[PDB]
Every structure is written in C-alpha cells, then in structure tokens.
C-alpha cells in the first residue's frame, strides 16, 4: 500500500500504488500531447499498478505534478537498500525537480498598479 | 550581509563568560544551551535565540585560537 504526493503551483497529485491511470484516463492519452514525453520520463529513463488523482492548478502544472507523483511512488517500494539511495541520484542527475517540489508561487498585488511590481503611468503636465 | 546588532553580542558575551564549561564549539549543543532557564536566559523568541546561539558558537571557536 503505497501513498505518494506531487505538487506544482496549486496542483496536487495524490498517488496510490499497488504491486497507470491519471484521473481515470489512461496515461498514454493525457490530452496535452506535445508534452506527452514529460509525463513518461521516469519510465523511459529508468511493472506495477498506480492510480493518480490530480486537482487544482492548470494544464502544465498538473502535468508537472504527476511527473513528480509518478517518480516518487516508484521510490516507496524500494527501501533500506542501495537502490533506494542510487535511483534518487540518477533521477536528480536528469532533473532535480523530479524529487523536490518547486517552491515558487504567485505574489500579491499592491495598490497603485495592476500587478505585484508594475505601477501606473506618471505624468507631470 | 547579516551583521549582529549589539543586542545579540552583549548577551552572547555574558553567556560565553558564565557558561564556558557547557558550550562546545558545535552549534546544536549551544542551541540547547541558549534554551535553559537554569543557566538563566530569558530569550523571548526562537529566532532571537538562534541568532544569539549562532554568535555564541562563533565566540567559542575564537578563544581556542
């Protein structure tokens, strides 16, 4: 019984793993299709059964949260052995984002401009 | 770019002078040591305590050399 997470901006991917469905749709058919190679990286760079529920965020953030849940769930069945600590280093030596989440978030808007840093045009005459 | 104010330093000197025996020059032990109220130290916050302990640990490895 493996339970695993993945996070992007607001997206949360909850993975349940038993010895590959994304929101009940087969993985091969994840609609953003020019990014299909991204959701399959851990497979084709390194089976079993996994179940993914991703919510919140947008298209790309959801893809990137499943890219982390998938790779983090295949690291919670191997344990206490050198594979556990070596497959992690192989995963990061491609993209560290595969293991550790991206902390960035939206900053708040401040009064006097449309955005967080952009202000309003100033005039003198 | 992190300059300790006189408030950190003045407390850190009395702490190192009073408790020379207790403080090893390694930081976790001093983090505990800036916590006790028997070595009486009223630190009203944990960030403040961490900054004081960071200067205490540095005061320790300067009296050896």
């Amino acid at each position: 019984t493996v339970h695993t997470l993945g996070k992007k901006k607001n997206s949360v991917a909850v993975a349940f793993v038993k010895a590959i469905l994304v929101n009940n749709v087969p993985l091969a058919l994840v609609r953003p299709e020019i990014l299909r190679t991204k959701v399959s990286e851990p497979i084709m760079i390194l089976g079993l059964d996994m179940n993914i529920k991703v919510a919140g965020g947008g298209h790309v953030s959801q893809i990137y949260a499943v890219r982390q849940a998938i790779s983090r769930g295949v690291l919670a069945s191997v344990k206490d052995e050198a594979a556990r600590s070596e497959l992690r280093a192989k995963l990061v030596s491609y993209d560290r984002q595969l293991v550790v989440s991206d902390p960035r978030r939206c900053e708040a808007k401040k009064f006097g401009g449309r955005g967080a840093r952009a202000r309003r045009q100033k005039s003198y005459r | 770019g992190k300059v300790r104010t006189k408030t950190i330093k003045r407390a850190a000197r009395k702490i190192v002078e009073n408790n020379y025996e207790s403080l090893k020059p390694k930081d976790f032990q001093n983090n505990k040591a800036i916590c006790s109220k028997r070595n009486v130290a009223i630190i009203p916050s944990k960030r403040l305590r961490n900054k004081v302990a960071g200067y205490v640990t540095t005061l320790m490895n300067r009296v050896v050399k």
């Binding site: 009940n24 749709v25 087969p26 058919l29 609609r31 | -």
Partner: protein, 130 residues
C-alpha cells in the same frame, strides 16, 4: 471502454451512427440559430446537431452516479463574446438546443429522470459501453 478511447474519436464516430435507427434526428429550428449568444455566426458543418448530441451523451456517461441538468450543460459549452470595445466576457450557451436534445434522449429509454436532472440509464449506458 468509454473512458479509454481518444475522446475525439468516440464523439465523431457515434454522431455518424446517430443517422441510423431513427435516433434523436434533428428538428427544423436547427436553421437560422446560433449555438450561443457569444457566437456571431451559425455553425457551418451541417451535421452539427448530430455531433452536439453525441458530445452531450458522452458528457452524461462520465457522470454515471449523479445528475447533470440542462442549464449546467449550456455552461459547459461556453465561449467569450468579442467585438465590443470593452474587455471580453464569457457567456452561457443556448438552453433550447440542449433541452431539445435531452428531451429526445429521454425517449428510447436512453436516460431516466431523477430528483433534479437527467441521468444515464442502464440502457444507453450499456450502448455507449458497447
């Protein structure tokens, strides 16, 4: 099953099958109607009613347990209304076309009424599954 096949395949392969066996076949008001208040022209592909109803039933199948409703279907096919010199805003689609579709789909026992809204009946659920 229904969830497996590429969603764009099932919709346009069942709408061609919507021409057989005297299913919902289109009424007359289909001409001179915009699918929404945000559209500025009528659809050009003449099979648009067929494809629309194929899509709405594939929408009903995915919500197997609970009930959808008509007003909340026009919201599903929403679009943004342009050309007004003001910032663009989103508009709900037309409930008459969708209600016409779901009325005829309540016939042939493809759907069953609920407490509030239509629901995918066991017959029709079996058909889409097959």
């Amino acid at each position: 099953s229904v969830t497996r096949v590429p969603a764009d395949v099932f919709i346009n392969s069942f709408a061609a099958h919507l021409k057989n066996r005297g299913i919902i076949k289109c009424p007359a008001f289909t001409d001179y109607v915009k699918t929404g208040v945000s559209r500025q022209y009528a659809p050009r592909d003449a099979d648009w009613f067929y494809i629309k109803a194929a899509s709405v039933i594939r929408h009903f199948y995915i919500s197997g347990s609970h009930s959808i409703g008509v007003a909340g279907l026009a919201r599903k096919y929403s679009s943004l209304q342009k050309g007004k010199t003001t910032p663009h805003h989103t508009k709900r689609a037309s409930c008459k076309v969708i209600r016409s579709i779901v009325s005829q789909f309540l016939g042939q026992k493809l759907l069953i009424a609920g407490e509030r809204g239509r629901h995918i009946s066991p017959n029709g659920r079996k058909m889409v599954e097959d």
